Design a binder for this molecule. Structure first.
Ligand SMILES: CCCCCCCCCCCCCCCC(=O)SCCNC(=O)CCNC(=O)[C@H](O)C(C)(C)COP(=O)(O)OP(=O)(O)OC[C@H]1O[C@@H](n2cnc3c(N)ncnc32)[C@H](O)[C@@H]1OP(=O)(O)O
Ligand SMILES: CCCCCCCCCCCCCCCC(=O)SCCNC(=O)CCNC(=O)[C@H](O)C(C)(C)COP(=O)(O)OP(=O)(O)OC[C@H]1O[C@@H](n2cnc3c(N)ncnc32)[C@H](O)[C@@H]1OP(=O)(O)O
Ligand code: FAD
Ligand code: FAD
Lengths: 607, 607
């Protein structure tokens, strides 16, 4: 039972902070009320803590085994039993479109439900993303393809996203897998893809939809020349869904990884074994990179939310350990060798550690749920008063924060969780070292942190003309401008907001200097990740302070018992974060204001 | 070649061109070891480390030790035992051993540079080889009779352990309850269970193991002052001839399953619980256990810090070699051109940022442990610093928790950049970086957690010392700042020195004000680790800048070729470190000056 959930904080964000319940029972969510949403969260949290978390250790210690002659993978039995628990509850259809068998709901509620699976056994959610992919295929498909997507969703087929090649990882546009058009309008896909998650999955599903980027013969170069293809593991009857002949797409290797071991990560060979890999052009148009980014956006949201879910259960494990571990005397009695021994939560450095973990875990939860409130036009209208166009641009702005800042932060603060256990934290008997291993990948797949920071600056700020950024900054400034019990926190936030504004101005400055001296663009690259992390810190501190303001109101109204303790912890967290994390942004702004190209001019031989 | 990439060039640069250790080679204690021989020794052990020692790095992780409950022994993988035999056959387990025990006299600074290579290539191999060094400590603390046993133990190459920790006594060594009962013949029977004992069994590597066990004589007082230290051998032996006799009652009962460092058997150790007494001999025949054991702990803390630093160094050189060859993307100056030539990733600004961060910290940390070691011999300290024996010992004691605490935390943090440089391939066991990360996570925990390092540094190495060692080091930094091409670095170092000075003053004020307000002491606890880390960053910046001043002198004298590249890299690293790492200490000073007890007052239930 490694997984420790936090429904209370989820509901606090969804209802008391963001007001997502304002849309429940109205319009698209007419048949889902606030009580039902709360019961779903409790239900999936309990299932996550039980049957899903049950095989978390098994999947790591008894990982999938590859048979290279059948080109298939065997998963451990306990993990497949967790997968069936997921399917039997319908949790592979959270927020799926109603016409595909789904229950309509705000994306903020959907991601909070998913948080529990990602905290308990994140590879289980990844294997279960087939219906979500069926829905993207549906939205992008022809009328006839929409009929296959409906079948795939109803039969619960698995799915993969197939981009990476050995020479084309960050540079997707360099891929050489090719597509050869047939007279009847299908295509034959030829190439080897690498690092494909779930490319085989034992007997979990009756079929797998591979969504494959490939370059049609004679198409131009880069990502703009790529097309997206529906390549099923098995041919099937397009009218009934009955499974047919094996299609020419075969796993030829399974990687040995640091963590996330139960997710089979596969070399995938298309058309290499003398059987054609038939693919159907998605939507029967050539628009591959744009179509595939519908998938990439969801994957990046998932990876950020995965890292955040894992830091949260890492923190709650550390806290429960610390509450019970007796070691040493209180610091006020450190010289008295007969003083009473105390539990380690009495020690300042452990409280520092735990509050650092708490504030980042909770601030990150607020960030991904805040981000999700812009993913439905109706939620964004009802809770923020912003129209659909700006909501989409704000969601797109925040996705690289959820992914890049979420993955980096969670991994770094799990170091504090492990440390809280002392030497025991190094044992596989406790789950934190596996949290660390399982979460290292989140800075890498779905685009590395450097790729997230480059997306954030060039596409989500500059190409956006700063409109989404200016929107969020205006909300932060409005909080600062508005009791004086948060006076010191608002002053710290004001300094941090000006620090980030100063970073944006410097980086924009280097970009405009590149009109005259091309090399000046390198300074944007030097400072981009630090800027992305600074915006994440500023958002964490703002959202914690918002949570603190709500908590003050609820305490003033007369909260008691466990509610009172919860609200007290929000005040302490927002105050701790403002005073210990935000001021570092000032030094980071001055560092960014002084970047230079010395490190770019250095001979490679001098490293 | 192997996973292990060594850096003898940087070691020799530090030892000779920066600290002038070659000035003592050939004279007095080191009469028979000249500079040429020292360099050939470093080259020889580097090749041993890259060859047979590194050969079983992966194997000890993938095929880890197995506990046998039928015999209460541990079995080690055959390839790792072959590596151990290569270490012994070359005499490398007698590096810096006293001449009368069979060693080769050498400066401690040379000794630790030699040991760095084993710690980089397979650090558990050095840990299993620490027997002869423990015999020397037993010799130094022993009676005349006991010195004869310690001589035999060195000559026969017996293994050794340091046996302190119990389930309820880890950081708080003084809570130990293992008991010592004196026998009529003047031996003792030791009774208790110890936990997490490194090398507590080692298969058939040795013919005997010396366990150095802390235990509380019946009737003694509480805390660490009531502990005594006992020589408890695995087998009884003839005190004159060394011939091995009957088994003594000290048995391993389990082996821990760990995140990393798997080939180091970490064992529960039972004394007197299996039907025969564990006979022990009181060391020095005096009751002075925690003082005696700290002779061992001091060495273990130097070892752990040097291990973490060795591991970052080979992590960096692996990532750098990968980056030079990995082609991905276009030059940022050609971002918008999708037919622009592809480049190797060292052309990308974020990768150069990541590599220079790894390089500056790895080399700064190497400078710190070598500098620390130049204070471990009175003669070296006199010859290269002009300091007498008493001040030397105090400065070495000041620097040890920096080597250990700042070393372990920094190495694990910056290996994250090493892994990131490989992209998705960094997450594969095919490359050594993910094992580096798992193997080095323990360095912040054993030999005293980081918080214990930070408390030792401030309470014992500064306050109890009345700032003598600290003022000495600060005066050497100020002298460098005092002194054109290094004007900016010296200005940034002056800011960092004043920041650390401000931190020390604030924390000393919180401590002294505890006399009138007891809870004031908690702010010392809240800030101690950040203070320790700030001193390590300041030392790193200063030593790198000193290196850059030597590099400038050598370039002015006409260095060419590979020498010139090396020197250019030192100037670049010192400058990058001063401009990108040092300024953050200003925000950390201001954070420390505003610490408060809110987080101490918060109800535990609010977390
Ligand atoms: C809910 C269910 C989801 C279904 C899931 C089913 C199976 C999967 C389950 C398992 C999960 C596994 C998680 C790990 C997965 C992976 O790693 S998949 C591989 C991920 N690969 C990447 O993320 C690529 C990283 N590299 C880049 O992003 C790089 O910056 C790119 C490739 C974009 C650079 O290429 P360029 O050619 O230089 O890009 P350019 O800027 O000019 O844009 C071209 C074109 O791309 C579109 N685009 C680009 N960026 C975005 C963003 N951020 N969002 C949307 N669209 C984007 C645009 O079409 C753009 O053209 P324009 O004319 O509009 O500019
Ligand atoms: C090269 C040869 C080496 C041989 C090695 C052989 C075996 C091979 C394998 C070993 C490698 C594996 C590495 C991992 C091994 C381990 O983890 S062993 C377990 C390590 N345990 C610790 O480090 C303890 C951590 N806790 C503390 O340090 C804690 O702060 C202590 C225990 C010090 C607090 O106890 P107190 O009683 O409160 O301490 P106090 O401050 O009052 O001092 C009491 C007494 O202790 C001595 N002392 C304390 N601190 C030091 C230091 N830094 N240096 C020397 N001596 C110290 C003093 O005697 C002191 O008395 P005073 O009157 O002088 O104050
Ligand atoms: C467990 C796992 C599962 C995966 N699953 C899938 C999957 O299901 N589907 C799929 O299509 N792919 C998948 N991948 C591939 C994954 O997305 C890539 O590994 C990732 O995009 C990084 O690419 P790469 O490994 O080639 O690294 P590289 O692109 O070679 O990057 C190496 C280094 O160079 C840096 N770099 C590269 N280009 C630039 C640039 N222009 N500017 C600055 N820095 C740059 C990177 O940040 C990194 O630090 C998976 C990978 C892993 C590890
Ligand atoms: C791989 C491994 C090998 C080991 N080898 C040996 C060996 O050979 N010999 C041996 O004797 N021991 C050995 N140990 C034990 C090791 O030194 C201890 O784990 C370590 O000292 C921490 O003690 P603990 O595990 O009981 O943690 P705890 O002392 O319970 O610490 C728990 C947490 O509380 C914090 N904390 C505790 N006390 C205080 C305080 N007073 N103030 C502030 N914070 C505090 C710690 O920093 C940590 O975050 C080994 C351990 C491991 C993991």
């Amino acid at each position: 039972s490694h997984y420790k959930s936090n429904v209370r904080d989820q509901v606090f964000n969804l209802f008391e902070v963001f007001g997502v319940d304002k849309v429940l029972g109205a319009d698209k969510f007419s048949d889902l009320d606030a009580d039902t949403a709360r019961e779903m969260l409790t239900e999936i949290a309990r299932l996550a803590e039980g049957p899903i978390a049950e095989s978390f250790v098994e999947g790591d210690r008894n990982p999938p085994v590859f048979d290279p002659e059948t080109h298939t993978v065997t998963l451990p039995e306990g993990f497949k039993k967790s997968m069936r628990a997921l399917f039997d509850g319908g949790w592979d259809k959270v927020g799926l479109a109603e016409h595909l068998g789904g229950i309509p709901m705000p994306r903020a509620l959907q991601w909070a439900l998913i948080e529990h699976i990602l905290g308990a056994n994140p590879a289980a959610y990844m294997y279960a993303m087939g219906p979500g992919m069926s829905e993207i295929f549906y939205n992008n498909g022809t009328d006839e393809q929409k009929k296959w997507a409906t079948i795939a969703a109803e039969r619960g087929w698995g799915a993969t996203m197939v981009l990476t090649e050995p020479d084309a990882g960050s540079d997707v546009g360099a891929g050489r897998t090719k597509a050869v058009q047939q007279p009847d309008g299908t295509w034959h896909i030829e190439g080897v893809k690498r690092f494909i998650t779930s490319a085989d999955s034992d007997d979990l599903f009756e079929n797998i939809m591979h969504l494959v980027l490939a370059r049609p013969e004679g198409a131009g170069p880069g990502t703009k020349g790529l097309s997206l293809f529906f390549v099923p593991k098995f041919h099937f009857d397009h009218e009934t869904g009955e499974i047919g002949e094996r299609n020419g797409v075969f796993v030829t290797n399974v990687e040995h990884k640091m963590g996330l071991k139960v997710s089979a990560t596969c070399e995938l060979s298309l058309g290499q074994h003398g059987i054609p890999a038939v693919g159907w052009l998605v939507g029967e148009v050539h628009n591959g990179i744009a179509q595939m980014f519908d998938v990439i956006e969801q994957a990046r949201m998932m990876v950020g939310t995965k890292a955040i879910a894992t830091l949260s259960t890492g923190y709650l494990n550390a806290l429960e350990y610390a509450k019970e571990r007796v070691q040493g005397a209180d610091m006020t009695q450190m010289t008295d060798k007969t003083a009473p021994r105390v539990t380690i939560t009495h020690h300042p450095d452990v409280r520092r550690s735990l509050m650092t973990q708490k504030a980042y875990a909770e601030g990150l939860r607020a960030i991904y749920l805040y981000t999700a409130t812009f993913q439905d036009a109706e939620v964004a209208q009802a809770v923020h008063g912003v129209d659909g166009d700006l909501a989409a641009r704000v969601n797109d702005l925040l996705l690289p924060i959820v992914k890049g800042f979420g993955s980096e932060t969670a991994y770094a603060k799990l170091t504090e969780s492990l440390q809280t256990l002392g030497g025991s934290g190094f044992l596989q008997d406790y789950p934190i070292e596996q949290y660390i291993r399982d979460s290292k990948i989140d800075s890498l797949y779905a685009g590395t942190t450097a790729i997230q920071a480059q997306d954030f600056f060039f596409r989500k700020i500059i190409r956006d003309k700063g409109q989404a950024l200016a929107y969020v900054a205006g909300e932060i400034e409005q909080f600062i401008k508005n009791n004086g019990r948060l006076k010191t926190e608002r002053e710290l936030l004001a300094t941090a907001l000006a620090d980030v504004q100063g970073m944006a101005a410097s980086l924009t400055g280097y970009l405009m200097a590149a009109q005259e001296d091309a090399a000046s663009i390198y300074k944007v690259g030097l400072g981009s990740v630090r800027f992305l992390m600074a915006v994440g810190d500023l958002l964490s501190g703002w959202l914690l302070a918002r949570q603190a303001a709500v908590a003050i109101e609820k305490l003033d109204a007369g909260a008691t018992g466990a509610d009172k303790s919860f609200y007290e912890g929000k005040i302490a967290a927002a105050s701790f974060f403002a005073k210990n994390m935000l001021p570092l942004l000032t030094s980071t702004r001055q560092i960014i204001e002084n970047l230079d190209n010395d490190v770019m001019e250095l001979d490679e031989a001098a490293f």
